C-alpha cells in the first residue's frame, strides 16, 4: 500500500530548470533504488505524457524522443527520494508533472502514482490582481480578476454569504504571462440588493472587496 | 514507436449506463502491456487494469478489460457516480511506454440551451489603457458551444480566451465564459460589441451585444 508525495509548486522563468522530487510517505516504500520510476507529464488541456523512466537496480534511463538530453531521471537509495531534474525550461512546459513506479525493478503498469507537482513557466513577477467589476444589464454578474501572477486566488461573495449561482471560472494565460479569472453569480432581476465579491491573492497579501452596482 | 488512440472522445452516459471505452495500438500488441487509469478531478491518476484485463488491487468489480491485437477495451459494468472521469490507456510493452489521449465519462442529460450574458469594460478598467468586454454562457449542455467575439460585425481571433467550469455536480450542466480584451485606443473605435453564441440546444444563434457609449 505504497503512497507517493511530490515536492511542492514551482515557478520558474524561460532557460531555467527544476528538478522535482518523489518521496514515500509513511514506512509503506521500501527499497527507493530497487524500483523502477516514472515521470509522466500532463499539460493543460491535455493527456498524459510519458516522459522516461529509470530501472530499479541498475538505473539505466530511457527518455522520450521531445526531452533527449533535456531531462534527468534519478534516485536517491540513501535518502529514499526519486528526482525528475527539466531544463532550458519553456513557457509549453507548464504543467502537472506526476511521480509514478510500479512493483519490480523493470518499467510496468504505473500502480503508485504522487499527487503531482505543477510546474509554471513565466517570465512574469508575483503580481496582485486588478478587481473590476461585471455590473448587471433573472439577472447575472460577477468580478473580473484580471492580470496577476501565480495562481491561485479565491473569490467569495458578500463575505461567503452569497453562494448561490455562483461560477467561478478557471483562470486563463493571456500573452501577457499574467493570469486573468472571471467569478459571477446569477440573482433575481428584482434586486436593492448590494453584491460585493473579495478576492484574496495569498502570493502578494492583496485582499481586494469591490461592489457591483448596475 | 506505438501509438495509443483512446475513442470516444467524450463518453456522455447516465448514472448506473454500461460505459464502454476503447484503446487502438498503432500495431499488434501482446494482451499484457496495456494498462488502464483514471483521473478524478483534482487527483493522482489510479490504475484500475494491468495485463489487459487483470483488475488491480482494491479496484472494484465493475470495472474489466479486454481485447487482443490493436484493439482494447475498458468496460464499466454500471456507472457509479464517481465513475465519472477521465480514462487513459497506457502501452509499456517497449519504449516509449505511450498513452492515449484520454477519454472523458461525463453525466449525459437532456439538452440545456445557454443563458447568454454580456457585461461591457468597467469605467474604471477604462481608466486604464485597457478594455474587457466579458461574455457568459450559463447552465447549458452539452458543453459543446461556439462563442463568436464581433467587433462592428467583425469576426474578431487571437484577442479572446474563453474558460468552462466542470460539470456541475447537481444539475450536470456546463458554464462559460469568454473574454475580449482591447486597448482603450482601439476599443473606443467601434460602436457595436456582440456575443454570437450558437449551441444545439438553440433554435438559431443567440446574440448579445451593447454600444460603446450604451
Known amino acids: 500500500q505504497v503512497q507517493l508525495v511530490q515536492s511542492g509548486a514551482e515557478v520558474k522563468k524561460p532557460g531555467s530548470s527544476v528538478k522535482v522530487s518523489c518521496r514515500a510517505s509513511?514506512?509503506?516504500?521500501?527499497?527507493?533504488?530497487?524500483?523502477?520510476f516514472t515521470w509522466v507529464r500532463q499539460a493543460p488541456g491535455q493527456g498524459l505524457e510519458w516522459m522516461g523512466g529509470?530501472?530499479?537496480?541498475?538505473?539505466?534511463?530511457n527518455y522520450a524522443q521531445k526531452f533527449q538530453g533535456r531531462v534527468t531521471i534519478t534516485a536517491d537509495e540513501l535518502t529514499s527520494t526519486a528526482y525528475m531534474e527539466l531544463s532550458s525550461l519553456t513557457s509549453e512546459d507548464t504543467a502537472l508533472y506526476y511521480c509514478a513506479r510500479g512493483l519490480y525493478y523493470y518499467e510496468s503498469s504505473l500502480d503508485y502514482w504522487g499527487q503531482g507537482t505543477l510546474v509554471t513557466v513565466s517570465s512574469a513577477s508575483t503580481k496582485g490582481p486588478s478587481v473590476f467589476p461585471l455590473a448587471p444589464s433573472t439577472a447575472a454578474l460577477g468580478c473580473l480578476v484580471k492580470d496577476y501572477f501565480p495562481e491561485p486566488v479565491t473569490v467569495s461573495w458578500n463575505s461567503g454569504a452569497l453562494t448561490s449561482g455562483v461560477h467561478t471560472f478557471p483562470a486563463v494565460l493571456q500573452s501577457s504571462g499574467l493570469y486573468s479569472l472571471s467569478s459571477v453569480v446569477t440573482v433575481p432581476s428584482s434586486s436593492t440588493q448590494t453584491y460585493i465579491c473579495n478576492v484574496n491573492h495569498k502570493p502578494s497579501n492583496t485582499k481586494v472587496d469591490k461592489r457591483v452596482e448596475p | 514507436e506505438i501509438v495509443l488512440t483512446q475513442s470516444p472522445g467524450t463518453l456522455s452516459l447516465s448514472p448506473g449506463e454500461r460505459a464502454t471505452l476503447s484503446c487502438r495500438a498503432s500495431?499488434?500488441?501482446?494482451?499484457?502491456?496495456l494498462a488502464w487509469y483514471q483521473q478524478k478531478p483534482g487527483q493522482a491518476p489510479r490504475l484500475l487494469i494491468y495485463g489487459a484485463s487483470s483488475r488491480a488491487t482494491g479496484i472494484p468489480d465493475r470495472f474489466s478489460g479486454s481485447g487482443s491485437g490493436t484493439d482494447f477495451t475498458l468496460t464499466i459494468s454500471r456507472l457509479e457516480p464517481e465513475d465519472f472521469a477521465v480514462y487513459s490507456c497506457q502501452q509499456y510493452d517497449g519504449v516509449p511506454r505511450t498513452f492515449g489521449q484520454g477519454t472523458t465519462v461525463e453525466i449525459k442529460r437532456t439538452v440545456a440551451a445557454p443563458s447568454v450574458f454580456i457585461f461591457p469594460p468597467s469605467d474604471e478598467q477604462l481608466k486604464s489603457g485597457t478594455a474587457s468586454v466579458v461574455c457568459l454562457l450559463n447552465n447549458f449542455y452539452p458543453r459543446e458551444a461556439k462563442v463568436q467575439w464581433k467587433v462592428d460585425n467583425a469576426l474578431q481571433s487571437g484577442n479572446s480566451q474563453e474558460s468552462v467550469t466542470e460539470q456541475d455536480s447537481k444539475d450536470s450542466t456546463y458554464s462559460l465564459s469568454s473574454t475580449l480584451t482591447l486597448s482603450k485606443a482601439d476599443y473606443e473605435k467601434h460602436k457595436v460589441y456582440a456575443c454570437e453564441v450558437t449551441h444545439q440546444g438553440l433554435s438559431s444563434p443567440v446574440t448579445k451585444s451593447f454600444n460603446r457609449g450604451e
Open positions: 529509470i530501472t530499479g537496480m541498475f538505473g539505466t534511463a
Open positions: 500495431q499488434s500488441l501482446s494482451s499484457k502491456y
Open positions: 509513511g514506512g509503506t516504500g521500501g527499497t527507493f533504488s530497487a524500483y523502477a
